[PDB]
Amino acid sequence: XXXXXXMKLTAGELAFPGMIILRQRGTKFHPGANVGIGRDHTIFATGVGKVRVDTQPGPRGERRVVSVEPLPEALAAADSALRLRQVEAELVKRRAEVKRAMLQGRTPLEPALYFPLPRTADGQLSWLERSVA
């Protein structure tokens, strides 16, 4: 069991898309800019930026809104929405290469089987073989 429910990335921590910022029961913290909210009110980042926790007026009282503020060197390399997506994609690709360099090939990253291509749909990448008409 254990059910660990707390805040994972504090304010001023650099975040990347998909990183869970806080896990809670009920909306103690409310989602803000560049932030998603899950089924169990998990707050997850949808942009590269530092987490900012600010307090705003609320319907019941003192709402705390968790947000991700994009970097000041981003929004300078970036219509704007397409440019931000391209800048974020390069940062995400660079993060993977740095992480693979730091884990020096000691973990099983990719399948590399002696088999025919791992089952591929028209889209490809299916770990499920399906017979074709």
């Binding site: 060197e73 300078a76 940062l91």
Partner: protein, 48 residues
């Protein structure tokens, strides 16, 4: 968190900062073209 296993969070934090470093340098250099602690001589010892 009860798992007695080393967290990968320090590696993830280091990867994120190292990933954004080329963008930071390029944009800071672009602003510097388009537009902290004082240190003393290292003495061997302070007793004559």
């Amino acid at each position: 968190y009860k798992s007695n296993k080393r967290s990968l969070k320090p590696l993830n934090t280091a990867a994120s900062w190292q990933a954004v470093q080329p963008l930071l340098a390029e944009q800071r250099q672009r602003a510097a073209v388009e537009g902290w602690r004082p240190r003393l001589g290292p003495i061997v010892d302070t007793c004559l």
